[PDB]
Write a protein that binds this ligand. Structure first.
Ligand SMILES: [Mg+2]
Ligand SMILES: [Mg+2]
Lengths: 254, 254
């Protein structure tokens, strides 16, 4: 009973710190979209211009929590990236199938989680349409990765994971829960999610928690496997991540 | 003996994480100095232009580890700031006495620690000269505060503090050690440090550690007061903070 109360406090602090990371990085694509140098490189994508944007994005990404910042042209090809010197450079790749590109193109802005296609690293993509005097020029994207957050959750001793409204695990202190599911997921909805490549080739399997037992207060007990450990019992609480479509669930070792 | 070894590892990890925070934020004033909009606002410091820089710096500071980013004109007055909406806005204040302004003006770049005059908040100021076609226009400054780092040190259970080459405490997991001294400090060198306003009005008193006893391996034992605690004995180790002029010292409770 007192464990449930403390666990709520700890879950609420995790979700609070997580919202603030996201909300901090929403500002970055918004300021870069109105940037004359960005607009200019899309108007005239010459070598000198793209090299200047490459250097600028690299320095901007160094200073910010976002792992990667990149510039996509109107055709959906990335022309500049902060990781331009890396073997995993996003430059030259076609993005155009990603909702973060096509919803930004259509609506002015977009945001979603994905397993990256070049990096093979999961993240949140926050994107903004770049507009010119005569209309849409491209899309600027910030990719936020949550490795540091996950490591902190892990070191707390109360594992946690974050799901969308379909119940798919996006962010997790235990890597092997990633893109597994809290909810059942009907065969006709699974195929479209899989084919979209949002979560790469993840089979989207239910999370392997056993003897899940719902309690009056909203919590559940369950049996779970953590690395190096035999099966152990946990209390699970959940809370909203405000300013997102996400839910945080946290396990407390009994 | 085994405590000293673990303590070295923990001190080395603190100093390593600290260097990386600093080195990440060095990139930010460097990229903003070559920014046409920044250069443009200094060439023509009109209301529309300064308002655009205010908004841009605000969004950039939100996304980055730096607390405040601000733009100083050639006369040393701050014309734009990320905190422009705050009661502690740096806009309108004269900086021109700070080494971070006048060394940037003279050398192109500067960096130092100070107790802020408007904020009353301590930080590292990393600055870069803004150059025009016909010469120096101003100075862009990023202010990095270390509250998050200090809180992490505190939560580790091994208190730590960071000194310059004069032995003045800049960064500390215990606030009351700030701007105290590890070394003695001759009366003729104290006056110039105090009068410079680098550390506000701090009396620059020696740290209050008692029964300091040097050990063969480089460590010392000492008696110290932590909040809520009576006097306790500590092992102290120190290590370089690479890429800085700083030394990290860490206490381990015996
Ligand atoms: Mg980054
Ligand atoms: Mg900041």
């Amino acid at each position: 009973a007192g464990l449930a109360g403390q666990s709520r406090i700890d879950a609420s602090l995790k979700a609070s710190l997580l919202r603030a990371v996201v909300e901090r990085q929403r500002a970055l694509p918004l300021v870069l979209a109105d940037d004359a140098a960005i607009r200019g490189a899309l108007l005239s994508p010459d070598r000198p211009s793209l090299d200047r944007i490459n250097r600028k994005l690299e320095a901007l990404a160094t200073s910010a929590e976002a792992a990667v910042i990149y510039l996509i042209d109107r055709s959906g090809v990335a022309v500049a990236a902060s990781n331009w010197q890396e073997p995993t450079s996003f430059v030259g790749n076609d993005y155009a199938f990603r909702d973060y590109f096509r919803l930004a193109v259509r609506d002015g802005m977009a945001e979603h989680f994905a397993m990256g296609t070049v990096s093979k690293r999961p993240g949140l993509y926050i994107s903004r349409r770049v507009d010119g005097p005569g209309g849409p020029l491209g899309v600027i994207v910030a990719k936020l990765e949550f490795d540091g957050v996950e490591a902190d959750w892990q070191a707390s001793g109360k594992p946690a994971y974050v799901t969308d409204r379909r119940g798919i695990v996006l962010i997790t202190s235990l890597p092997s829960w990633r893109f597994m599911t809290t909810k059942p997921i009907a065969e006709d909805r699974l195929a479209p999610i899989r084919e979209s490549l949002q979560f790469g080739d993840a089979p989207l399997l239910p999370l392997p928690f056993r003897k899940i037992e719902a309690r009056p207060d909203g919590s559940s007990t369950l049996d779970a496997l953590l690395p190096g450990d035999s099966t152990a019992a946990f209390l699970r609480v959940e809370t909203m991540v405000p300013s997102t479509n996400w839910r945080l669930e946290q396990l407390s070792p009994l």
